[PDB]
Amino acid sequence: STINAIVTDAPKGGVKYTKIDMPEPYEAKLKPVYIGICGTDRGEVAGALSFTYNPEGENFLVLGHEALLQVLDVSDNNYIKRGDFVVPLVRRPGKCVNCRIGRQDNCSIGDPDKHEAGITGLHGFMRDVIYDDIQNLVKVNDPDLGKIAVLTEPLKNVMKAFEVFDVVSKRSIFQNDDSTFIGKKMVVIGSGSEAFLYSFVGKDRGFDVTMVNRHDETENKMKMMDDFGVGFSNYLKDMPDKIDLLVDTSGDPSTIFKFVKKVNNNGVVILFGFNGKAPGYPVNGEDIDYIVERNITIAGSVDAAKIHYVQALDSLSNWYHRHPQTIKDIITYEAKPEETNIFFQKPKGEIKTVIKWP
Amino acid sequence: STINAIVTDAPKGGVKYTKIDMPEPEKYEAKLKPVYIGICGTDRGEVAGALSFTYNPEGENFLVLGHEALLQVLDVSDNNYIKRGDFVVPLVRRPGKCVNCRIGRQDNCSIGDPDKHEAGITGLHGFMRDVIYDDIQNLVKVNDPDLGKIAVLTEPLKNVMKAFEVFDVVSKRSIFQNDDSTFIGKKMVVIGSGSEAFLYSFVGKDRGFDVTMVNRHDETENKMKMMDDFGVGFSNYLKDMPDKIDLLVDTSGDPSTIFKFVKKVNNNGVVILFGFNGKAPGYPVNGEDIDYIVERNITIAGSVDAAKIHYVQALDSLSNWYHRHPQTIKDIITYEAKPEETNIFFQKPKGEIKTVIKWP
Amino acid sequence: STINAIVTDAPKGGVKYTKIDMPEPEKYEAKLKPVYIGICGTDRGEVAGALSFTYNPEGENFLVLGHEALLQVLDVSDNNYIKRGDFVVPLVRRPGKCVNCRIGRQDNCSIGDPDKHEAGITGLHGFMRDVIYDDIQNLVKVNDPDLGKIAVLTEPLKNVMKAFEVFDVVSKRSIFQNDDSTFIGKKMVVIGSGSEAFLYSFVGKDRGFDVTMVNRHDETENKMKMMDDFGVGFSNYLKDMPDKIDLLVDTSGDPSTIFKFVKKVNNNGVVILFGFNGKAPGYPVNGEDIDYIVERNITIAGSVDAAKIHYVQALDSLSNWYHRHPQTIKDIITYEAKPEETNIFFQKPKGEIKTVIKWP
Amino acid sequence: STINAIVTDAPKGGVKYTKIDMPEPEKYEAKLKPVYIGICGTDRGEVAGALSFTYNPEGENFLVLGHEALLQVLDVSDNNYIKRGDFVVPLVRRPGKCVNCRIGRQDNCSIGDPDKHEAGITGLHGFMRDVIYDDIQNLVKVNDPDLGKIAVLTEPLKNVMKAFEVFDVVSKRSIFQNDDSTFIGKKMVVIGSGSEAFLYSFVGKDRGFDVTMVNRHDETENKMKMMDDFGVGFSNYLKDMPDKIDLLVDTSGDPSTIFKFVKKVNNNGVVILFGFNGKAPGYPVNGEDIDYIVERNITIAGSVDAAKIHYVQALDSLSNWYHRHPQTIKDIITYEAKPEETNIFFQKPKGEIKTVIKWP
């Protein structure tokens, strides 16, 4: 069958909205409503990522992994039906001990055990028709969420990261002697989509949060943060210290390690940003000593499990029913598929750009 | 009252064996003398003026050295745990008031200095002196009569036990084990081949890991045969770099070496930073090294000191080891100095693994 | 100062809405009044003289009732957290000195009474009185101005939050989730249809469970609309006994009902014991009942009270629930009685879920 | 081909030492013979026909008995772990397909029969036969050569090691330790005085508990002496019941003894249900018993079987125990039988702790 789709030739690069031949084999058939894009989609189009590739036999890869889909047809089951809106899983499991319990996000082997829709050998979701198995679909249960549900994928990564935070913070009593997180200080390096999502969950877990960047911020972003009780600071003018939770979305060694030197005893550092091109920063013996004497834990986190998608939907609902303006304002452009230039340049004031599908 | 003691002037430096005046409380829970006291690089750095965070106890102009002690009880008030003549290992770190210190987890102090303090290091006299008074709660009883001087290894080993606790905690972030539930075939690499590295390596094997110590030069045949007695491999890494590492521990304190081995860590791997050296040269960590850590769900954890429970675990291990491999355990202690030989704080004996002081 | 307060004579019984002398205490940080106060079986059990463990404060001959409180700050010394006028829920359980109380986890007190004490229950005055003195630490600020009277539900919800904490701890003994990592179709059964049941059921739902409340009789259609509204089922187990349970929470305190539901619990099931009734008759647990528990690796966990942090989460859940289902959450508070109406303590408003007192 | 075996007709019962055909399957990784095989209450139950969940392997009329085994490798495919002549302990429980089985945690099978199977008990042949074929992954290598026959205690001891893992998981709900981080003075009581109670106590002591076994009659001086060597106490609870219990382990399966000891358990106390007996009579549990559990945040966890890692842990402890107290470990083995003495399944030669079969 012939259908419309946004494809790349991974890892060589390029993007075209075009026609392709997708035949059927499956438990469910779906179509897109919205599909977000992130740095990775752009990295794929730029040919900056060596780990991506087309599915076996084929010479293109359908882009798109941040999806909100609609069930057109479905097998016989007690969980979803025609008309239901769903978020598909990006990462699908291999055979390892972690994959086989639904924690492909903690895949013990890496590629080629696990695979990612739109990224590694699995067609993405920017195409008219999509076949899948029921278990790779997560039901949206809040009817008022609508398009905001497209933020699930970016948000699940945050929920897994926070899982990892909950795990490693058990090495000591991380809380105050009154049992709470009151006055505990979170700092998020960066002020884009992911940082925004980190900051909001942080707020829900009870931290005082403060996003940060190497420049002032738009009045758009500034107001959003205030709406969620989230501070901001240009670190070139006012450097925070005494940090209990450091989360990095920059990927820049120089910036990560300068903030690490502000981390409190028993502080946790979450590394989350890719930046393969970031310049090297010289980590010295004094830096190591600082980490050791303070029992600091630095943890890299990638992707997440199905359960985290569920958690993410629930949080989007709650935040939507309390600050709907600010949540809507996360999405900063909605785009036609033909508008393939969004993969090459960042619109003005972008936070999250999405593609509205016809 | 007047006693002999080995002292310094922290943080300035220097060392001397000498007479000093110390209080002689009539009221105390326990009164002890030292039998053996270990030295480590912190002692040597104290004495060389290399450590700036060390200080003398309030209103005093010396600091008695020594935090690795094996002591004997001279006298003690009625209690259910220890009595005159028993051997004990004293806690180094003493609790402040924070949430962690109040539960006996000062090793995880939330403030740092000056909430917690360490014997012979920060604001509290150490154990190289004729007489020592303490509370019972701060003493760990050696329950193995056969251990003798081996028990002086309790302090450097408890650091290892806490570090492995850190490992147990953080490795709960995914299934670390094989699909048969075990650690069989999991690979531990320990940067360094000194006494801390030996102790890490041995606990590693007890935990079921395949273990290899590594250094930037070949090792003595004695060390080699020690490693070989315990099933521990060695590798001069300039001739063959270990790869595919599940648990990596560093005792060097050296960035270049740390980050070089990080790049060989598997998915879900754990890196423990334990060593430190403030003089260590910088190493450029780039975006590529960050990504590597991220995409692998790697955890990098600093670990310092340990809790009293780790002292008990340490003693149990030293005893298990000694009753299996008595010789190689004895060979950890490579020199028994007298307190007059204060040059051991300056010059390392030849073939040093662990040097100790046999107190008069 | 003379003030209005409803009091009792712990443990013996009875209640008056009367004046009492409430002096200004020697040291305190905040002065407060009540806005609303919830009531539960325990208050009704104190009035009936049905609790041997309660007692009046030291020296005094009366106990102010009321532990389920919403309060307003009349005055408070300057701090970063609360201002005059703010609304707060006060902690019921106050810390002693054990290793758990000193960290803010007096809910897990290691000693029991007299280490911890509970406002309105165990040597401490409850909140049904015109003026209240307290420290800031023991107050939980409402940060959602929309919540209003719903915030008086924080106390009963707090207990449920702790219990889900206990479930998250003990359920780590094995993989409780499906092989997709979720709880989809895991079955929670709650014994009971009272206020605590509903609160368990709603949290159950936020955790991903399929939830069914149960009882030995049908339920009023106000209850069935609330249930249906949150997606919670109901079943009368005399006509339809649920089977195959993954999480069983009892709010009844009735042995025989407990142990008959335990026999429907699956491998790796968790049983939370929460409700209590000292009057309930004995069910004869036999060799098989135990065998059933053992072979399935079931965990039966008793849970009492909660920590401050759980008050904070309780308040956050109510906020979420209120902005999603404002009417069903409002529908929980079935009566706003007056201090004067000291009959509530004795009789139950017809089809009560939660009875509150609007304080003048 | 023809081999000797001891067999039952599960679940009917009976026992016989006889000849069976054992074909050499097409492909296998390992061929083994038994050296020693232990017997437990389960074997006696099987033979007695008292266990209705037991069954022969599909389309066979008999079931080879025996799950506590120590075997030697006759032949194995080349691999890096074991080789011919190596001694091993084979896994009793073999995995099915559920989320726990597939990660090597069949001991926590989410389904039970017939997902998981158990050698000698459920549809898989046991170890009392001349020849046994297995896969490597299912064998746990004995690394200490001095152990000898003592290594046959692995299987009963791995049950204990998993139950201590359950304890470690559940006791995270609060601070279970003293405020010095230790288990000093924490009280362990173990109901029963048989093989399992002894191994529970020894582990108990290694974890730092004060341990007391209890039974409802005095014990032979063989047993008492052994307790004494490991610093474990005993009490006939008819005469004297321990109180103030922090960890309670039951090996009786008897409700009345269980619940009577539950009412001695401290706040944050843990109870392990492990013993089972379907013939044990009912004992009334009332509202006030439930209430006692609730108010103390007690946890009651049933535990069955263990994972492969727990077999490896068991072997490590048996070594540690053997090099400290060789004579006393040997004494746990109280009778060595020849295969023709099938009497041991019906009558337990008195003074019994562990009866074993030496395979000729």
Ligand SMILES: NC(=O)c1ccc[n+]([C@@H]2O[C@H](COP(=O)([O-])OP(=O)(O)OC[C@H]3O[C@@H](n4cnc5c(N)ncnc54)[C@H](OP(=O)(O)O)[C@@H]3O)[C@@H](O)[C@H]2O)c1
């Ligand atoms: N680990 C995972 O599972 C996973 C999954 C998806 C994406 N990611 C990564 O997560 C990162 C963040 O996602 P995103 O969608 O938020 O990306 P984004 O929208 O491009 O935002 C990146 C943020 O980092 C800021 N930044 C760059 N250099 C900085 C510095 N020196 N100091 C402070 N801030 C700095 C950027 O600011 P300006 O734009 O204002 O310069 C921007 O705010 C991306 O790098 C992506 O690689 C990770």
Ligand SMILES: NC(=O)c1ccc[n+]([C@@H]2O[C@H](COP(=O)([O-])OP(=O)(O)OC[C@H]3O[C@@H](n4cnc5c(N)ncnc54)[C@H](OP(=O)(O)O)[C@@H]3O)[C@@H](O)[C@H]2O)c1
């Ligand atoms: N966190 C804590 O609780 C704690 C407590 C005490 C001490 N420490 C630290 O732990 C470290 C080790 O303790 P230790 O007593 O075992 O001291 P040590 O014997 O001096 O150990 C240092 C080891 O590291 C080796 N090394 C140095 N640079 C290296 C490199 N680039 N590559 C590989 N190996 C290298 C040394 O070899 P050579 O001798 O051949 O150069 C030596 O084997 C010290 O740094 C100390 O500062 C930490």
Ligand SMILES: NC(=O)c1ccc[n+]([C@@H]2O[C@H](COP(=O)([O-])OP(=O)(O)OC[C@H]3O[C@@H](n4cnc5c(N)ncnc54)[C@H](OP(=O)(O)O)[C@@H]3O)[C@@H](O)[C@H]2O)c1
């Ligand atoms: N652990 C703690 O920290 C804590 C704190 C506060 C309260 N509690 C206990 O929590 C329990 C519930 O609190 P609550 O405020 O919800 O009181 P509640 O409204 O009385 O709830 C009790 C529920 O149990 C039902 N029930 C009684 N007997 C039953 C049986 N045999 N089978 C099935 N269901 C039965 C009742 O139904 P009917 O009304 O139809 O009889 C009622 O729905 C009380 O026992 C209280 O003592 C515990």
Ligand SMILES: NC(=O)c1ccc[n+]([C@@H]2O[C@H](COP(=O)([O-])OP(=O)(O)OC[C@H]3O[C@@H](n4cnc5c(N)ncnc54)[C@H](OP(=O)(O)O)[C@@H]3O)[C@@H](O)[C@H]2O)c1
């Ligand atoms: N994974 C599991 O959950 C698992 C695995 C294997 C075995 N088991 C069970 O674990 C138990 C122990 O194993 P074992 O091999 O040690 O069996 P065992 O030697 O028969 O031990 C049972 C002990 O309980 C004592 N006893 C019986 N009734 C008692 C009572 N009312 N009060 C106090 N003590 C009482 C017995 O005393 P006398 O012998 O002097 O009567 C004996 O010491 C058995 O019940 C068996 O069913 C469980």
Ligand SMILES: [Zn+2]
């Ligand atoms: Zn995998």
Ligand SMILES: [Zn+2]
């Ligand atoms: Zn502290």
Ligand SMILES: [Zn+2]
């Ligand atoms: Zn307490």
Ligand SMILES: [Zn+2]
């Ligand atoms: Zn299974």
